[PDB]
Design a protein around this nucleic acid. Structure first.
Lengths: 114, 209, 56, 121, 120
RNA sequence: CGAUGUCGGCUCAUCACAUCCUGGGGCUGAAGUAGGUCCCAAGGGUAUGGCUGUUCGCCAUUUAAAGUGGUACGCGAGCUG
RNA sequence: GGACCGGAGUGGACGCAUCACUGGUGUUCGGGUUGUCAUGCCAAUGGCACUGCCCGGUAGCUAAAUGCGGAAGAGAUAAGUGCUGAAAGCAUCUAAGCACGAAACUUGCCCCGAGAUGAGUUCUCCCUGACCCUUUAAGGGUCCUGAAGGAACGUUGAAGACGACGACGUUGAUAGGCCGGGUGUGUAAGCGCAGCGAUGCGUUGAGCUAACCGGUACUAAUGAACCGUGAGGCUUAACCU
């Protein structure tokens, strides 16, 4: 009856920050190369979806040496621990899948009121 | 110490939603009991059958109500019969036996299927469609040839053509390791709970498959 | 796409074994006005179960 | 990736565009785009590269637009398909330096040299 | 196949379905009674009573939304003046489907669809 | 001859084993990896392309393998010309 | 140079299931915009132009996504290798006996499956009233009673071409609606401020939002009525006749 929709809430991460699409975000990702376990930094413009439970993720595009790399990170996965919103961007669309294609272009900055 | 399984798998199964089921004990107090005990007189084999769920006790038919009415009237929704081991007596041992080392190794899975209607010959078995533009008068997704001219003179019995797919049963096995927990020292039983409700029961000897 | 022998009157009337009209086999009598109607239908004078649902 | 796929090259010795002529490993293997070996020809080359136009040799796919799925469900998608040129018999990289990002699934057997020469893993 | 799917396409296209439904909602709100077919009646209530529950809160924005649907200012005026507060205490179910006899020109299951009004 | 539509391809196949691979043996100029021949075995699997309409054939490259035949040289009230 | 035998993982092709993820589609969700017409006009909306062109996108379906699987075993064996052994005082795998031996056979695994007319078994439920003609286990008609259950009819479904098969039918969450959420689009209209104006800023992550999730009788699921009976043949064998 009043039971369901809580098994996905047992393993949430309530320490996540809130971000809009268009900001350049920093994602620290645990990686295993052997006995040691280090961190990886991923920067770039986020093309996010909002919280579909555990099944929520955000798409980040970075350009290393000429071509873009898109990485979608599952929000509540244990390998993603910390997100920093960093510079906050102003765009109209929820999905920046076409503005990500163009080169040398950066979105405008808006820091006051989200 | 010596002690093993008997007429026991479990008493509680919860409605299917996803099919992975990482376990956590939830706090809600309900009562469940074995109601079904068969009669003794007119049979040469002594068989026992299980049930699950709950019915309204208004749409239960009087034959089914009388079936459930032997030792307490609590009805369910389904019935499944199995073989003979010995009989029916109380075999309850002492308090605490099996906490030492031998918990679990694996589990098994069981399922059923979904109705896709009068499916086509490309949907049902993975047929190849002919080329849609180089000519192809009305033969893009049609079945092609179904036989071999005169000396058969007929189409064979196990032939793949268009019909209803779905509304059948399926069965699979062998789920694996997903994650471990060690630091908090909790008692764990492991496995994805098997498929949709409507399963046939797992009555098995030691692990063969 | 055509026959080679004429099908018989037996086979012709035997294909029509399932082509028979089934009846309603029961009507319902409205408590207010004693006329009969279909199940879950207006009594063709403006009555459902207990009220005159149609003024016309 | 598939047969008749135009691909860029990461290594310096491999020169500009290469095209996949056969998808190695398997009978009717259609699509192999993560760390698999593919037979290529060179469709357009610069004279600075050691290889020349029309030379058949092997490659390994390094970047793909389809993208590899991580175990947690993460997908790393690269814009444009890339390969690193290898010898036909020894299956070792001809190119001295690797350009661009590489993925951590290119760690098995002879590709430790590729990820060691590569900047970003 | 279709699973978990809503909306009956009524053997006609999307633009015609929307136009039929605007005209039907206007006719229901005007005359308080409609004789129509049974699937048309079911989809008719499924698109009419959202308007009546929009019409409880009298605002210019809600008049403009209730004018983006059904496109008749007499209908928006009735729906916010007389309907609305007449159905303010109700929580859903502003329509009633009573089935009548089959149509003469074609065997159509016909149905009177009407509100929960009173005569006087 | 008061009409049995002719190749190849596509789609779909089925059978025989005079067996391509996988399986079990013998012999060998079988030291091992690798081969050759013969016996048993038809359960399953048994390529993508450049050339011209091709069955064929040449070639690039792959695969453990790219079998030989019958089925109106299978299949036009299934398609192509 | 390079091992059979025996284990461990990881792939290609194939098949099944699923929609948790990655995606695709989503003409019924939202937004940007061109041309034009209309709502009296400004504003705001709607209609046509492939859904006007696009941009995203819920459910459902889906693969390119994910989970699994073809085994291990057992019996009888083909080729072959054998033991004991005479016929044929030696020999010999065979004639009497016996033991191995493969993806083939029969089971093992998974589906249909008592129309298996050889129509099977188990549990439960329901019916234990009269009269005439009797061309006689006889068999027909009349009155009463017509159960268990089914069918019909409405609400319908992740079931479906139609049937069928599930769920519900007022001691009711079955379907719509309504309420709250979630998702999706992306700061609605109105008003105010700045600017000559386009437009920008605040109200404001605003407003709309489906098929989704939890709750609710507001609407439709009415009570009849229909079918189905009234103890179920003859012989033979076990407790009194």
């Amino acid at each position: 009856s009043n039971i369901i929709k809580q098994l996905e809430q047992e393993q949430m991460k309530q320490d996540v920050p809130s971000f809009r699409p268009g900001d350049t975000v920093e994602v620290k990702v645990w990686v295993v190369e052997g006995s040691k376990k280090r961190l990886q930094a991923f920067e770039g413009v986020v093309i996010a979806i909002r919280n579909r439970g555990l099944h929520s993720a955000f798409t980040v595009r970075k350009i290393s040496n000429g071509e873009g790399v898109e990485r979608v990170f599952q929000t509540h996965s244990p390998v993603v621990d910390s997100i920093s919103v960093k510079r906050r961007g102003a765009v109209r669309k929820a999905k920046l899948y076409y503005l990500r294609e163009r080169t040398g272009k950066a979105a405008r900055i808006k820091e006051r009121l989200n | 110490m010596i002690g093993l399984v008997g007429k026991k798998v479990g008493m509680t199964r919860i409605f299917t939603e996803d099919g992975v089921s990482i376990p956590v004990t939830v706090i809600e107090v309900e009562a469940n009991r074995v109601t079904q005990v068969k009669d003794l007189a007119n049979d040469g084999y002594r068989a026992i059958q299980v049930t699950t769920g709950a019915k309204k006790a208004n749409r239960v038919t009087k034959p089914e109500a009388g079936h459930f009415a032997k030792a307490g009237v609590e009805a369910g929704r389904g019935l499944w019969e199995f073989r003979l081991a010995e009989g029916e007596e109380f075999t309850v041992g002492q308090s605490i036996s099996v906490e030492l080392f031998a918990d679990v190794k694996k589990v098994d899975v069981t399922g059923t299927s979904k109705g896709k209607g009068f499916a086509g010959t490309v949907k049902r078995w993975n047929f190849r469609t002919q080329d849609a533009t180089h000519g192809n008068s009305l033969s893009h997704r049609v079945p092609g040839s179904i036989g071999q001219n005169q000396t058969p003179g007929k189409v064979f019995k196990g032939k793949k053509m268009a019909g209803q797919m779905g509304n059948e049963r399926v069965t699979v096995q062998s789920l694996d390791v997903v994650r471990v927990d060690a630091e908090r020292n909790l008692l764990l039983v492991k496995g994805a709970v098997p498929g949709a409700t409507g399963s046939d029961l797992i009555v098995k000897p030691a692990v063969k498959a | 796409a055509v026959q080679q022998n004429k099908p018989t009157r037996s086979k012709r009337g035997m294909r029509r074994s399932h082509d028979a009209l089934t009846a309603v086999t029961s009507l319902s009598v409205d408590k207010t006005s004693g006329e009969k109607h279909l199940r879950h239908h207006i009594t063709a004078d403006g009555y459902y179960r207990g009220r005159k649902v149609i003024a016309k | 990736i598939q047969e008749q796929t135009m691909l860029n090259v990461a290594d310096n010795s491999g020169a500009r565009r290469v095209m996949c002529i056969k998808v190695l490993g398997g009978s009717h293997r259609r699509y192999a785009g993560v760390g698999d070996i593919i037979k290529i020809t060179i469709k357009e080359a610069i004279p600075r590269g050691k290889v020349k136009k029309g030379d058949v040799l092997k490659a390994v796919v390094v970047r793909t637009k389809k993208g590899v799925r991580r175990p947690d469900g993460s997908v790393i998608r690269f814009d444009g398909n890339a390969c690193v040129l290898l010898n036909n018999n020894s299956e070792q990289p001809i190119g001295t330096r690797i350009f661009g990002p590489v993925t951590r699934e290119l760690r098995s057997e002879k590709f430790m040299k590729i990820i060691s020469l590569a900047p970003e893993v | 196949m279709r699973h978990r799917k809503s909306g009956r396409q009524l053997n006609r296209n999307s633009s015609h379905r929307q136009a039929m439904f605007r005209n039907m909602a206007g006719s229901l709100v005007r005359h308080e009674i409609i004789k129509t077919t049974l699937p048309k009646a079911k989809e008719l209530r499924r698109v009419v009573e959202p308007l009546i529950t929009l019409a409880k809160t009298d605002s210019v924005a809600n008049r403009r939304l209730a004018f983006a649907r059904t496109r008749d200012n007499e209908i928006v005026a009735k729906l916010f003046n007389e309907l609305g507060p007449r159905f303010a205490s109700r929580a859903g179910g502003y329509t009633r489907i009573l089935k009548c006899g089959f149509r003469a020109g074609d065997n159509a299951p016909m149905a009177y669809i009407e509100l929960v009004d009173r005569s006087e």
